[PDB]
Amino acid sequence: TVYHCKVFQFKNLQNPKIRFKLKMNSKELSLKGLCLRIRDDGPGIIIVVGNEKSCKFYENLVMKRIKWNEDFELHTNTGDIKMDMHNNSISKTWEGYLQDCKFKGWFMKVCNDQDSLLRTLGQFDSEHFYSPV
Ligand SMILES: [Y+3]
Ligand SMILES: [Y+3]
């Protein structure tokens, strides 16, 4: 049979609340794929693979329900940080079908450089799904 697939690209995900939601929902839905980002503060990619119903549900989650631009606060050993996200965004970039699915669950990974990200995507035959800048 045939696997439905979607891919999204974000400018930032330092927000722990966003991270939680993406996790929990991937968990509850039986979707497969990954979320990769260049360092804690960099851009990245979400890839999702499953049946049509689940993919559209996730599309809704990510493009409609999540406030990618919502301000949040971080706490450290030297003090507090207020993060304003007015210029963060999410973008849905690819949409289609696969005969083959190389992902084995749904996982996240923070990479050190863009090449580390591209190398990873390539282990799953997916270098092309990303758009560098
Ligand atoms: Y249909
Ligand atoms: Y703001």
Residue numbers in the entry: 335 to 467
Q: Which sentences from the paper describe this structure?
A:
Except for an N-terminal region, Prp3 is highly conserved from yeast to human and contains a C-terminal domain of unknown function (DUF1115; PFAM ID PF06544). Here, we showed that Prp3 orthologs contain a C-terminal U4/U6 di-snRNA binding region that encompasses a DUF1115 domain and a preceding peptide rich in basic residues. Our crystal structure and targeted mutational analyses demonstrate that the DUF1115 domain acts as a ssRNA-binding domain that specifically recognizes the first 10 nts of the U6 3′-overhang. Our results indicate how Prp3 functionally bridges U4/U6 and U5 in the tri-snRNP by Prp3-RNA interactions on one side and Prp3-protein interactions on the other.
